[PDB]
Amino acid sequence: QGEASTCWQLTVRVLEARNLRWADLLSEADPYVILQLSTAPGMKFKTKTLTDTSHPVWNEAFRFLIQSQVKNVLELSIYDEDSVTEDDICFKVLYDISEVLPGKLLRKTFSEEELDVEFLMEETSDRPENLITNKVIVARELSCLDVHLDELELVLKGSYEDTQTSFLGTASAFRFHYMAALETELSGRLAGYLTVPLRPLTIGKEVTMDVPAPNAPGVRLQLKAEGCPEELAVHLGFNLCAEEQAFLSRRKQVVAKALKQALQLDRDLQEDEVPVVGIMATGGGARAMTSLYGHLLALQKLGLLDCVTYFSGISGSTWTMAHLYGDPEWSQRDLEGPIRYAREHLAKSKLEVFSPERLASYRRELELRAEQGHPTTFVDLWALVLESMLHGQVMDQKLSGQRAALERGQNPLPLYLSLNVKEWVEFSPYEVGFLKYGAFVPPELFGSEFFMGRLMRRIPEPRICFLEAIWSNIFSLNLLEASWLQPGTALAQAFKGFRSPNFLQGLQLHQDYPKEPRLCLVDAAYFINTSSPSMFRPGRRLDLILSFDYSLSAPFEALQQTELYCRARGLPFPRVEPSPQDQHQPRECHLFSDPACPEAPILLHFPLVNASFKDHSAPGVQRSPAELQGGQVDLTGATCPYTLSNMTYKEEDFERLLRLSDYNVQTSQGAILQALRTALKHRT
Ligand SMILES: *[P@@](=O)(CCCCC/C=C/C/C=C/C/C=C/CCCCC)OC
Ligand SMILES: [Ba+2]
Ligand SMILES: [Ba+2]
Ligand SMILES: [Ba+2]
């Protein structure tokens, strides 16, 4: 868990710049330099400002403390000072100070414009800093400043709380959290600024400061600094959490029970013989949602859904997931119930979702939300509209609540995967977190305010439509055919007269580790992946993956991305090399298995294709000429009702796609049982 490491003292002296650009109107620059360290947020150094020079000579020196176990990036930048306007940046450079070695002085020229700097790392004689680390994420050492009371402004730069301010005059107190390695001060004021220094890595003392009013009875403060009492609310690790491991035992015995019947087995399976079976699903909006319902149906009817330990999806797939898991026994109960729900809501027209009655109720909820501590973003609006499109109404269900669906191992564990600004964030009812960083919190706390792995303020867990918006977000970070160009105006006009920190805030990285205004996101990564990263989280050990793919072009892209993703992490994974025949007309089910590979999971892949459903009404059964229509599913050409934009499906069109999907899995029963048998010997 813990790591003791001494800091080094880095002195950087800013010498000169050369060839600095002029400001407009034949005005020479009045330049100064700003220094900022990435690992000392809120702390700035600034040189003296020189006047009318393209070749300023500052020769100023500054001192930082540097933790060598952390990645440290020095930002140094040159501004042109202006008495009236905000200053214009004319030069910026980011420098990794790993290069600088202790003892060795190092002269650098950063580059027409140039900046000369000298660096000196020196050993120091402080106590070592106490770090908490993961070997990729590092929590720096935190101290707390405590202030008692007997128009007060307390400023402590570098702290989570920047400034604090009570109005009272009776027995108030305040807490400041800040890194122990910072060299900073506390400033107080009711004129005159009283300042107390806070030297780095030192044991704090009791301090009494009287702060003068103007010019009336002064105020007395008691100050003391100590290591922060709180424990870490963020879990740092690359192992599965206890709840997931417990669940795995519960779930493995219903899978054992299910397998025995499905495979007509000789004896009962012990826990360590149960093969881990996962569902992996891509995005694709409404098309993915409905097609996935069809897939689950097939798995239920074949008695194979009970054999599945893990259920992962992206974007549209999570819509199917979120609803089903609203019911704690969805996998045991009949699926045709939830299908009807989805179908009916999908057929319902979405004109009213943009009616000022609902728009009123959205903004009136955003304002309520905004009065609470909540940044307001388009994604939170998207949450409300999507909730309205998907249901008729507010749905009072929450991710933490889906634990109910796992108490007795009665459903698979759901893994909602999100790609954020790129990092993969995995959501489950037990925990939410960054796969890369191995940093997780329980879903109740997702959205709450954090600092250095510590819970600062508990916000109430939000309604699941707000997480769904994250997962299916379609919208450009800066909003600033003819169908959905008019709800844009209706929304804009209705919302006129109207910044997002996450649970890693404060944490740091271990060392050894001309027109484009866009309405939507456009990176291919947002639309072309599948939920592989959840299937390859360190502890999961997957034996068989059922890969459902909802792309209309490129049925193998997401698998090829997954091959790359694994290749780059040294994870066993079969090779996806489909023949030209397989590209042109794929079929219902493709096995990718490398017994050339070893402990690689077995992979059954299900492209979204028509193929043999054209002339079969059900598995094996030929299609009558009376149900010819039933097998004509409009997957291509114009007026394809299953395009990514479309959020209204005629019940008829819903049914073709659902039944097609059901059929593709059902008709592949043999391959699935084959692969299930194979996953048995491979597990042992
Ligand atoms: P996932 O598979 C999610 C795919 C989501 C597609 C959703 C389609 C939405 C159309 C409705 C949009 C609402 C309009 C909002 C206002 C925008 C215009 C404002 C000027 O990810 C790949
Ligand atoms: Ba000037
Ligand atoms: Ba200015
Ligand atoms: Ba106290």
CA atoms of 568 and 198, how far apart (whole Å): 45
Q: Is it true that the peptide bond before 215 is cis, omega within 30 degrees of 0?
A: yes
CA atoms of 632 and 619, how far apart (whole Å): 16
Q: Is the CB of 19 under 6 A from ligand 1?
A: no
- Are 469 and 379 within 8 A, CB to CB? yes
**3-class SS of residue 371:** helix
**DSSP per residue over 152-191, as a string?**
-EEE-TTBSS-EE-----SS-EEEEEEETT--EEEEEE--
Q: Which ligand is nearest to the CA of 85?
A: 3
Residue 113's nearest CA partner among 73, 78, 61 is 78
Q: What strands lie across the sheet with 129-133, from one edge to the other?
A: 2-5, 129-133, 137-139, 508-509
Q: How was this structure determined?
A: X-ray
Where is the binding site for Ca(2+), in residues? 24, 30, 80, 82, 88
CATH of residue 638:
3.40.1090.10
Residue 98's nearest CA partner among 511, 584, 665, 541 is 511
Output the residue whose Cα is nearest ligand 1's atom 15. 488
Q: Is the CB of 202 under 6 A from ligand 1?
A: no
- Are 31 and 55 within 8 A, CB to CB? no
Token pair 């407009």: residue: 24
- Are 510 and 136 within 8 A, CB to CB? yes
Q: Which two tokens stand for residue 248?
A: 């795995």
- Are 606 and 548 within 8 A, CB to CB? yes
Q: What are phi and psi of 8, to 5 degrees?
A: -110, 155
Find the catalytic residue in 159, 291, 315, 428. 315
CA atoms of 453 and 637, how far apart (whole Å): 51
CA atoms of 56 and 556, how far apart (whole Å): 58
**3-class SS of residue 422:** coil
- Are 119 and 106 within 8 A, CB to CB? yes
Residues with CB under 5 A from ligand 2 (ion): 27, 30
Residue 413's nearest CA partner among 246, 275, 262, 299 is 246
Residue ranges making up the domain that contains 405: 236-683
Please state whether beta strands 106-110 and 114-122 pair in parallel, antiparallel, or not at all (unpaired).
antiparallel
CA atoms of 446 and 461, how far apart (whole Å): 7
Token pair 């009283």: residue: 194
Burial of 407 (0-12, 13-18, 19+ CB in 10 A): exposed
Residues contacting residue 480 through CB under 8 Å, at least 6 positions apart: 517
Output the residue whose Cα is nearest ligand 1's atom 5. 285
- From ligand 4's centre to the CA of 119, what distance in Å? 41
**DSSP per residue over 67-98, as a string?**
-TTB--EEEEEEEE--SSSPPEEEEEEEEEGG
Output the residue whose Cα is nearest ligand 1's atom 12. 484
Buried b (16+ CB within 10 A) or exposed e, 13-52: bbbebeebbebeeeeebbbbbbbbbbbbbebebebebbee
Q: Which two tokens stand for residue 177?
A: 């959290």
CA atoms of 244 and 246, how far apart (whole Å): 5
Does the annotation mark 315 as catalytic? yes
CA atoms of 285 and 574, how far apart (whole Å): 28
**3-class SS of residue 673:** helix
DSSP designation for 451: E
Please state whether beta strands 449-451 and 439-441 pair in parallel, antiparallel, or not at all (unpaired).
unpaired
Q: Which ligand is nearest to the CA of 384?
A: 1
CA atoms of 439 and 278, how far apart (whole Å): 23
Residues contacting residue 471 through CB under 8 Å, at least 6 positions apart: 314, 315, 318, 416, 417, 418, 427
CA atoms of 558 and 281, how far apart (whole Å): 10
CA atoms of 533 and 424, how far apart (whole Å): 7
Residue in 282, 472, 549 to alter for ligand 1 test, most ligand atoms within 8 A of Cβ: 472
Q: Is the CB of 473 under 6 A from ligand 1?
A: no
Q: Any alpha helices (H) in 134-275, and if so which ranges?
A: 242-262
DSSP designation for 27: B
Q: Which two tokens stand for residue 374?
A: 């909540």
Please state whether beta strands 590-592 and 602-606 pair in parallel, antiparallel, or not at all (unpaired).
antiparallel
Residues contacting residue 228 through CB under 8 Å, at least 6 positions apart: 142, 143, 144, 177, 454
CA atoms of 55 and 15, how far apart (whole Å): 11
CA atoms of 164 and 156, how far apart (whole Å): 9
Q: What are phi and psi of 493, to 5 degrees?
A: -60, -40
Q: Is the CB of 647 under 6 A from ligand 1?
A: yes
Q: Please report the atom of ligand 1 found closest to the CA of residue 389.
A: 11
Number of Cβ within 10 Å of residue 180's Cβ equals: 23
CA atoms of 680 and 462, how far apart (whole Å): 41
Residue in 346, 474, 478, 521 to alter for ligand 1 test, most ligand atoms within 8 A of Cβ: 474
Q: Which ligand is nearest to the CA of 88?
A: 3
Q: Is the CB of 314 under 6 A from ligand 1?
A: no
Instruction: Tell me the C-alpha to C-alpha distance, in Å, between residue 103 and each of 6, 120, 181, 343, 618.
Output: 16, 7, 21, 71, 77
- Are 573 and 597 within 8 A, CB to CB? yes
Q: Is the CB of 644 under 6 A from ligand 1?
A: yes
Residue 251's nearest CA partner among 435, 428, 463 is 428
Find the catalytic residue in 52, 523, 615, 645. 523
Instruction: Tell me the C-alpha to C-alpha distance, in Å, between residue 627 and each of 273, 611, 616, 618.
Output: 45, 16, 9, 11
Q: Which two tokens stand for residue 117?
A: 């700097």
Number of Cβ within 10 Å of residue 629's Cβ equals: 9
Q: Which two tokens stand for residue 658?
A: 């659902």
How far from the centroid of its chain's Cα atoms is residue 563's Cα?
22
**3-class SS of residue 496:** coil
Q: Is the CB of 489 under 6 A from ligand 1?
A: no
- Are 127 and 201 within 8 A, CB to CB? yes
Number of Cβ within 10 Å of residue 132's Cβ equals: 19
- Are 238 and 228 within 8 A, CB to CB? no
Q: Which two tokens stand for residue 150?
A: 């007997």
Residue 607's nearest CA partner among 644, 645, 660, 654 is 660
Euclidean distance between the first and the last CA atom of the chain, given in angstroms as a whole number: 33
- From ligand 1's centre to the CA of 474, what distance in Å? 5
Q: Which two tokens stand for residue 418?
A: 């999100």
Does the annotation mark 266 as catalytic? no
**3-class SS of residue 4:** strand
**3-class SS of residue 460:** coil
